Design a protein around this ligand. Structure first.
Ligand SMILES: COc1ccc2cc(CCC(C)=O)ccc2c1
Ligand SMILES: COc1ccc2cc(CCC(C)=O)ccc2c1
Ligand SMILES: CCCCCCCCC(=O)O
Length: 581
C-alpha cells in the first residue's frame, strides 16, 4: 500500500477509524486526560483525510507505527508523566513500537467506574459522540489489552442503554442494573483477550495456535481441517496484531475473517445462522461467543490412525507439529465436554508417548495404549469440578469465595490481601456461572474460566513478584497452569505475620457500605487471619469469620454503633487469636 493510513481510513470508515485510534492512544497513555486524547485523534484523522486525497503527499507514505508513534511522542508533559515511554521516543522503528508495548502499565488502579445517571444522561444528550468517546477512553485505559473492535461493540451496547433509559421514567433503576451487567460483560471480554495476549508474551505464537485449534475444533466439529487451518492462522494473526497495538490492522483482518466465516457458514457450523444475519461488530462478537455445533454422526474413530497404525513413528518424525496438530484437531472435535487446557494436556501426553515409544525397540506395542494414558488426566479435573460444585451449591457464593481465599492465601501468603481477595472472589464467580449448567458442560466452563482467573493472578504477579512457586506455575507451562496451582500447598518456610491490632479493627463506616463492599472488608480480614495463622484449619477460620460477621451485624444494629465496635471489637480480636491455634 502506498499510504496505509489512508487505506485503513477508507476501509474502516471515519467513525471506527476515530474510535479505534482513540482506544489505541488511551491504552498506551492511561494517565493523560480525555480532552488531550481527542485532539491527537482529530489530528491523525485529519492527516488520514489529507493522505486519502493525495497519497503522494508529505509523510503519507510512512507506516502506521511510524505515524502513530510520532504522534504519541508529541504529547505534552510526556517525560514527567511517562518516563518509560519518553525513553522509547528516541528510538527508530520497529524498536520504538517494541519499547512502547513493554511499558504498557497492565494495571493503573484508577477509580472504579461509578454510573451517575443524571449527569451522564445530560452529557449523552448534549453530545452523544463525545460521550461515547469518553466511554471508549475510560474503558480502554482501565484495560490496556482490550480488543478495539470488541470495545466498539460494547460501546454500542452502552449507547443502547442510554437511548432506552434517559427519556424513560426512573433513571436510576433503568441504567444501574444494565451498566452493572455491562461492566460484568466488559470484565469477561477483557479477561479472555488478556489471556490471548499473555499467551503470546509468555509462551509464544504456537501456544495460541494450539489453544485456538482446540477451541475452534470444539465449536465447529462439522468443519473440515482445511477450513479450521485457515480460521486459526487468520485468527492468530488478528490476535497478535491487537495485542501488539495494531488496532487498525486488527479491525480490518477481524472483519475479513468474520466475512469469510459467514460466506462458508453452511460447511462450518449450523449455529452461525443468527450471527451472520447481523451488522459488522455485532456479527464478529456473535461468532466469537457462538455456541458449539452439535456432534456429527460420522466423526471418525481415532484408534486406527493415532494408536493402532504401524508407521506412526515414521509419520510423527516426518512432520511432528503437523501430526500433533491433526491429533489435537480430531480429538478436540469429539470432546466439547473437555476443557481447552485438558485437550492440550492430552496432546502433550500424546506427544510424550510418541517421543518415548519411538526410541524403544518395539514401538507399536508401546504406543498401543496411548489413549488409556489420558484417563487419569480426564478424571482429576472432573472430580475437582464435582467437589467444588458440591461445596458451592451447599454454602453459596460468599462462603465458597471464602473457602477459596483461605485455600489460596495458604498457597501464597506473601501475595497482597487485595489481590488474594480479588482472585478468590473471581474464582467463586466460576461457581456461579458453571455449576448451574448441565453437568457435561461444567468441566469446560470451569477450567476455561479458571484460565481467565489464574492468568489475571499471573498478570498481577508480574507487576508485584512475591512467590517463586507462583512464578513457576505462571511461566513453566500454559496447559499445566491450573494443575500446577492445584498442586500447591502451604509452605512451612513462610513466617506467620505479626499480630497488628489495627488489621482486624472495624468501625461504623462499614454499615453504610453496600453488600459486596461489606464482604470485601470481611474477606480482607479473612486473608489477614490466614496470614497470621497459616496452620489454622479452614473449619477454624469459618468459625472465626462467622464471629466477625455476627459482630458486624450486631454493632450495625446497635443504638450507639461506634461504642459497640470500640467495646466488642478488641474482645472478638483477642479470642480470635486463641480460636485459630
Ligand atoms: C465450579 O467452580 C470452581 C471454582 C474454583 C475451582 C478451582 C479449582 C482449582 C483447585 C485448587 C486447589 O486451586 C478447580 C475447580 C474449581 C471449580
Ligand atoms: C466464612 O468463612 C469461611 C471460611 C472458609 C470456608 C471453607 C469451606 C470449605 C469446607 C468447610 C465446610 O469448612 C466452607 C466454607 C467456608 C467459610
Ligand atoms: C500441536 C500440539 C501443541 C501443544 C502445545 C501445548 C501448549 C502448552 C504448553 O506446553 O505451554
Amino acid at each position: 500500500h502506498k499510504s496505509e493510513i489512508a487505506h485503513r481510513f477508507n476501509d474502516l470508515g471515519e467513525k471506527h477509524f476515530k474510535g479505534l485510534v482513540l482506544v489505541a492512544f488511551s491504552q498506551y497513555l492511561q494517565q493523560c486526560p480525555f480532552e488531550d486524547h481527542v485532539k491527537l485523534v482529530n489530528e491523525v484523522t485529519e492527516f488520514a483525510k489529507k493522505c486519502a486525497a493525495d497519497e503522494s503527499a508529505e509523510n503519507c507514505d510512512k507506516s502506521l507505527h511510524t505515524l502513530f508513534g510520532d504522534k504519541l511522542c508529541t504529547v505534552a508533559t510526556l517525560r514527567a508523566t511517562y518516563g518509560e515511554l519518553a525513553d522509547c521516543c528516541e528510538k527508530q522503528e520497529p524498536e520504538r513500537n517494541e519499547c512502547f508495548l513493554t511499558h504498557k502499565d497492565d494495571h493503573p488502579n484508577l477509580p472504579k467506574l461509578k454510573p451517575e445517571p443524571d449527569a451522564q444522561c445530560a452529557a449523552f444528550q448534549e453530545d452523544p459522540d463525545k460521550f461515547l468517546g469518553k466511554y471508549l477512553y475510560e474503558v480502554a485505559r482501565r484495560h490496556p489489552y482490550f480488543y478495539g473492535p470488541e470495545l466498539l461493540f460494547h460501546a454500542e451496547e452502552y449507547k443502547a442503554d442510554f437511548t432506552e433509559c434517559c427519556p424513560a421514567d426512573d433513571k436510576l433503576a433503568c441504567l444501574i442494573p444494565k451498566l452493572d451487567a455491562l461492566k460484568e460483560r466488559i470484565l469477561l471480554s477483557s479477561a479472555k483477550e488478556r489471556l490471548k495476549c499473555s499467551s503470546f508474551q509468555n509462551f509464544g505464537e504456537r501456544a495460541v495456535k494450539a489453544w485456538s485449534v482446540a477451541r475452534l475444533s470444539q465449536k465447529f466439529p462439522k468443519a473440515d481441517f482445511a477450513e479450521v487451518s485457515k480460521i486459526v492462522t487468520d485468527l492468530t494473526k488478528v490476535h497478535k496484531e491487537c495485542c501488539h497495538g495494531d488496532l487498525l490492522e486488527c479491525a480490518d483482518d477481524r472483519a475479513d475473517l468474520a466475512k469469510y466465516i459467514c460466506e462458508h457458514q453452511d460447511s462450518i457450523s449450523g449455529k452461525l445462522k443468527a450471527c451472520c444475519d447481523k451488522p459488522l461488530l455485532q456479527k464478529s462478537h456473535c461468532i466469537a461467543e457462538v455456541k458449539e455445533d452439535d456432534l456429527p454422526s460420522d466423526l471418525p474413530a481415532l484408534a486406527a490412525d493415532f494408536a493402532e497404525d504401524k508407521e506412526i513413528c515414521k509419520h510423527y518424525k516426518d512432520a511432528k507439529d503437523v501430526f500433533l496438530g491433526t491429533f489435537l484437531y480430531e480429538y478436540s472435535r469429539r470432546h466439547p465436554d473437555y476443557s481447552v487446557s485438558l485437550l492440550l494436556r492430552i496432546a502433550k501426553t500424546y506427544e510424550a508417548t510418541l517421543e518415548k515409544c519411538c526410541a524403544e525397540a518395539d514401538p507399536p506395542a508401546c504406543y498401543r495404549t496411548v489413549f488409556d494414558q489420558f484417563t487419569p488426566l480426564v478424571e482429576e479435573p472432573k472430580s475437582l469440578v464435582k467437589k467444588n460444585c458440591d461445596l458451592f451449591e451447599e454454602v453459596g457464593e460468599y462462603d465458597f469465595q471464602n473457602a477459596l481465599i483461605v485455600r489460596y492465601t495458604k498457597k501464597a501468603p506473601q501475595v497482597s490481601t487485595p489481590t488474594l481477595v480479588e482472585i478468590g472472589r473471581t474464582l467463586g464467580k466460576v461457581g456461579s456461572r458453571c455449576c448451574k449448567l448441565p453437568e457435561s458442560e461444567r468441566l469446560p466452563c470451569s477450567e476455561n474460566h479458571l484460565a481467565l482467573a489464574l492468568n489475571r493472578l499471573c498478570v498481577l504477579h508480574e507487576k508485584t513478584p512475591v512467590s517463586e512457586k507462583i512464578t513457576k506455575c505462571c511461566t513453566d507451562s500454559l496447559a499445566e497452569r491450573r494443575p500446577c496451582f492445584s498442586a500447591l500447598e502451604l509452605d512451612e518456610g513462610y513466617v506467620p505475620k505479626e499480630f497488628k491490632a489495627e488489621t482486624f479493627t472495624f468501625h461504623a463506616d462499614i454499615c453504610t457500605l453496600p453488600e459486596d463492599e461489606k464482604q470485601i472488608k470481611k474477606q480482607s480480614a479473612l486473608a489477614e487471619l490466614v496470614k497470621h495463622k497459616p496452620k489454622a484449619t479452614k473449619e477454624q477460620l469459618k468459625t472465626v469469620l462467622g464471629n466477625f460477621s455476627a459482630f458486624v451485624a450486631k454493632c450495625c444494629g446497635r443504638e450507639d454503633k461506634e461504642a459497640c465496635f470500640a467495646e466488642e471489637g478488641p474482645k472478638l480480636v483477642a479470642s480470635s487469636q486463641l480460636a485459630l491455634a
